[PDB]
Design a protein around this ligand. Structure first.
Ligand SMILES: CCC1=C(C)/C(=C/C2=NC(=C\c3[nH]c(/C=C4\NC(=O)[C@H](C)[C@H]4CC)c(C)c3CCC(=O)O)/C(CCC(=O)O)=C2C)NC1=O
Lengths: 161, 48
């Protein structure tokens, strides 16, 4: 398992060395910014439904995707699409709290591109929907917290593409 | 003994039309306007 503090600990364990000053400083930075990250994460969870609604409205709705034959034409596909965005956001916020991009790669980005390719989901459309979520999440979270959230959101998009 | 005018040979034109400027504009317009929204119709969001 990987977290920001845990990854510093894991690197130190591989060395076998006692805690270095550089390791202490990096861990201190994680301790320092945890407050802003925590408050924003709570806000994200509270307004999670509104965020995915805003994202599909801004990117994935009123287009050919939701018009016939667009991989969202049916209610089953639409429900799976909003569910997929919801999972993307949930594991992304998990990782944003953790501070480490490794967690999302472990769960969200493990075979995700292959699965989407097999099912015929548009990779680009998913990426643009993720970016639209990034804008909405930045608006709700605020600039300081949203910038941190944006980095891990963008890591998810990079894994997809 | 040769025939100066043996027969008049048909020629295949080199320049293919529907690439010519006027038809090309019109072909673009008909295609693009068809893909766009249609005036005077009740249902337009249903169409793919
Ligand atoms: C094949 C199954 C299927 C259906 C049916 C379907 C419909 C559908 N209805 C939509 C919107 C909508 N649907 C309604 C529905 C209603 N508002 C009302 O007052 C009524 C009570 C009610 C209908 C009689 C509204 C208001 C919107 C627009 C939402 C908005 O933009 O504010 C949207 C999102 C906007 C878009 O088209 O991109 C879809 C996809 N999609 C599907 O995949």
């Amino acid at each position: 398992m990987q977290d920001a503090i845990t990854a510093v600990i894991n690197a130190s364990d591989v060395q076998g060395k006692y805690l270095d000053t550089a390791a202490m400083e990096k861990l201190k930075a994680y301790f320092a910014t945890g407050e802003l990250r925590v408050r924003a994460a709570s806000v994200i969870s509270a307004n999670a439904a509104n965020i995915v609604k805003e994202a599909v409205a801004k990117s994935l709705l009123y287009s050919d995707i939701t018009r016939p034959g667009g991989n969202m034409y049916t209610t089953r596909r639409y429900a799976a699409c909003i569910r997929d965005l919801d999972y993307y956001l949930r594991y992304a916020t998990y990782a944003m709290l953790a501070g480490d991009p490794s967690i999302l790669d472990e769960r969200v980005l493990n075979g995700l591109k292959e699965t989407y390719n097999s099912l015929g989901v548009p990779i680009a459309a998913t990426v643009q929907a993720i970016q639209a979520m990034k804008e909405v999440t930045a608006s709700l979270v605020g600039a300081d917290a949203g910038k941190e959230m944006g980095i891990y959101f963008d890591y998810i998009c990079s894994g997809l593409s | 003994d040769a025939i100066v005018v043996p027969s008049f040979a048909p020629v295949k034109p080199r320049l293919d039309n529907t690439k010519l400027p006027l038809l090309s504009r019109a072909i673009a317009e008909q295609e693009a306007k068809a893909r766009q929204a249609d005036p005077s119709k009740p249902r337009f969001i249903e169409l793919g």
